[PDB]
Amino acid sequence: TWSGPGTTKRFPETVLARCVKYTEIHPEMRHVDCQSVWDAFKGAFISKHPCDITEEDYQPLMKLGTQTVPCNKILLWSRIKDLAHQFTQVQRDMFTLEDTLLGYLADDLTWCGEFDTSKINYQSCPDWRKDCSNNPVSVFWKTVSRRFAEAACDVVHVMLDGSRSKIFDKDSTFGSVEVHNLQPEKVQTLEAWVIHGGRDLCQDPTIKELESIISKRNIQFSCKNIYRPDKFLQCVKNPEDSSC
């Protein structure tokens, strides 16, 4: 018995249906065999102790999910999911992790197995603080986020929530995995967009921390206040407007 919530109800059918849905509509991944994807996903955590999952467990899934995305148009984000995703619906050549097949399969879901059975545990799954860091969910996100960040080049963008305490959180997935896997051999600049909830938030101590982390990797840093998320989406859609 673990402290975290159990595997999401109907997780196998949900993952399969998301794969079918994504692959039948996104032409770049039409080749994918969704039954193979599920078998590979399931094989990562079934019949395994859910505190000893490795990235290698997910390698067969990563391979089936291979997707040659444009390196220069990646939008990272942290604790501002809905707006980050709205953004890539407007500026459609850009994408978030969850716009890729693998990110889309797993978004908002929970899953784990048991070491002594081939069953999915719907009762409970490990909480990353209270039980163990190396669980099926945490290790998945850590594997795909690292690879996504490693794929990035040129100017990489990150959306951050400026209304919260710790605009940049070094303990988030962005703060602990993604930012440390931006390769300086091909990423030249990280641009931060701090979103407001109704001052200059690019001066906040946590943005200076991010700037410092980034400088040390030999990557440039820009930061921008987005005061009016509504006008920002409008102007990205139609930059010819005299209001922008």
């Epitope: 148009k73 040129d154 100017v155 641009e191 820009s222 930059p239």
Partner: nanobody, 123 residues
Framework: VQLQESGGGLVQAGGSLRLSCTGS????????MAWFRQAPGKEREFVAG????????LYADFAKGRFTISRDNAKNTVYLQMNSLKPEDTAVYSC?????????????????WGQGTQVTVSS
């Protein structure tokens, strides 16, 4: 968008120039902008790019540490500071205005172009 480059000229190896690209007609403050160059018998090649939201910069490997791209929205101008010039920097340098968010390295994805300004570096 009408674009006009200036600031090119003849310099000795090791010298500097500052190119500017001034926009008449429509503003380009919400377009990504790039500098490209084209030597006499060759294809255009990416030199540097700059975004419009946060004005983030991007350089060709040959440009890093020598060239600096910048923009000033009020003046409707993009600048290329070029230091430590070499003979193989000799070319026609042109600015281009793109669309969307990022400054890509592919000339044919840029909508609006200037005529260019000559840069000649003697040995």
């Amino acid at each position: 968008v009408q674009l006009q480059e200036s600031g090119g000229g003849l310099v000795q190896a090791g010298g500097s120039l500052r190119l500017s690209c001034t926009g008449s007609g429509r503003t380009f403050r919400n377009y990504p902008m790039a500098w490209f160059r084209q030597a006499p018998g060759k294809e255009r090649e990416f030199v540097a790019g700059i975004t419009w939201v946060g004005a983030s910069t991007l350089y060709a490997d040959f440009a890093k540490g020598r060239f600096t791209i910048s923009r000033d929205n009020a003046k409707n101008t993009v600048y290329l500071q070029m230091n430590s010039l070499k003979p193989e920097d000799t070319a026609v340098y042109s600015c281009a205005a793109g669309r969307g968010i990022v400054a890509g390295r592919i000339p044919a994805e840029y909508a609006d172009w200037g005529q260019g300004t000559q840069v000649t570096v003697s040995s």
